[PDB]
Design a protein around this nucleic acid. Structure first.
Length: 62
DNA sequence: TCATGTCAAGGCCGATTATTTTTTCCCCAAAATCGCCGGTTTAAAATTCCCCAGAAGG
């Protein structure tokens, strides 16, 4: 009934089975290969992805 | 070094485990069938005993 609930269930399902079941070709649990991965470090501050609009305040202040 | 399809599930087969049913084996008792031996009966074959004729010897 809520997208937050759906995302929570999806993440739990992934971490339970999807990223735990061994792959049919690599034949190994994805998390072990993840541990083998070497990704570049993240920046401290994330690229701000937020709608930016300019508005005007009414006479009263509303 | 570019760019470059990949993973999961379903179905089928084989092997293993569990449950049920059927068949066999062993031992004991009773009945039936079959086998062997002996005796009896029937049929066929063999041997010995009396009178007629022929042949041989003195």
């Amino acid at each position: 009934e809520s997208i937050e609930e759906l995302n929570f269930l999806l993440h739990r399902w992934l971490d339970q089975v999807a990223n735990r079941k061994p792959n049919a070709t690599t034949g190994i649990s994805p998390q072990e290969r993840w541990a083998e991965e070497s990704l570049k470090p993240l920046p401290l501050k994330d690229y701000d992805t937020s709608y930016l609009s300019y508005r005007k305040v009414h006479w009263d202040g509303s």
